Design a protein around this ligand. Structure first.
Ligand code: CAC
Ligand code: FE
Ligand code: FE
Length: 253
């Protein structure tokens, strides 16, 4: 325990800056993918484990493919459960995929929701689903992106890991959903984790003005460590502006 506030993602090449952090007052938590942890060497893992003595961890995975057709990877799920136990961190988020369009249909909602309920049963925790950029919008879609997300997470009864940039990117690429309409309609009571990497900064403020609580917010990004820490201080200063002005509580994971 315990994750709250503003954090930074772990990379083997930032290990020297992470290992010099004397506490988690500034970098309040870090993020790691299981796909990278699993394939760490002995010394890379040592450095990581040594940083995890001071800086708590959230697990955000790349490859579980929650809306995919291939059966769920039990070898991967087992490493996720092992990490949750090892680092004492009862959180997990991943993505829907990764050519073809991602159709926002009820058939895909029911399919994805059902797999998320299986992942939840195995891990014995509730997971969060991250909104991602998609390349091709399906002609067959019966709903828009925020409807789709909302529907999946309400039918799986899981959280939302909200990525601000991915909202902006789907608005730029497709022109289908105003990022302001997105945030106004997202099930914000379910957002327990946020990612941010100008107009996008303002979408963070727009979200912060509307959430029910203040979740952990990670700077997602190759610049030098202390620059990355100054960017994290700004996310945090922005969090405190909104916790103060709106009387919010900090969500602690
Ligand atoms: C780096 As992403 C598209 O999973 O927020
Ligand atoms: Fe992601
Ligand atoms: Fe992200």
């Amino acid at each position: 325990g315990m994750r709250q506030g503003a954090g930074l993602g772990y990379r083997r090449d930032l290990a020297e800056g992470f290992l010099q952090l004397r506490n988690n007052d500034r970098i309040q938590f870090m993020e790691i993918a299981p796909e990278n942890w699993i394939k760490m060497g002995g010394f890379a893992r040592y450095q990581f484990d040594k940083v995890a003595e001071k800086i708590p961890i959230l697990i955000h995975g790349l490859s579980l493919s929650l809306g995919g057709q291939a059966p769920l990877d039990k070898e991967l799920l087992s490493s996720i459960k092992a990490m949750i136990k090892q680092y004492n961190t009862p959180f997990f988020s991943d993505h829907l995929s990764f050519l073809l369009p991602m159709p926002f249909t009820d058939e895909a909602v029911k399919h994805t929701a059902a797999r998320i309920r299986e992942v939840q049963d195995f891990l014995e925790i509730q997971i969060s689903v991250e909104n991602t950029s998609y390349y091709l919008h399906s002609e067959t879609s019966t709903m828009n992106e925020v409807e789709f997300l909302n529907a999946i997470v309400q039918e799986a009864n899981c959280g939302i890991h909200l990525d601000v940039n991915n909202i902006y990117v789907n608005a730029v690429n497709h022109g289908l959903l105003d990022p302001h309409v997105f945030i106004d309609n997202v099930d914000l009571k379910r957002v327990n984790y946020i990612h941010i990497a100008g107009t996008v900064w303002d979408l963070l403020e727009y979200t912060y003005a509307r959430l029910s609580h203040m979740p952990p917010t990670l700077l997602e990004r190759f610049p030098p460590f202390e620059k990355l820490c100054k960017e994290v201080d700004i996310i945090h200063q922005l969090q405190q502006k909104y916790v103060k002005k709106r009387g919010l509580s900090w969500l602690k994971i």
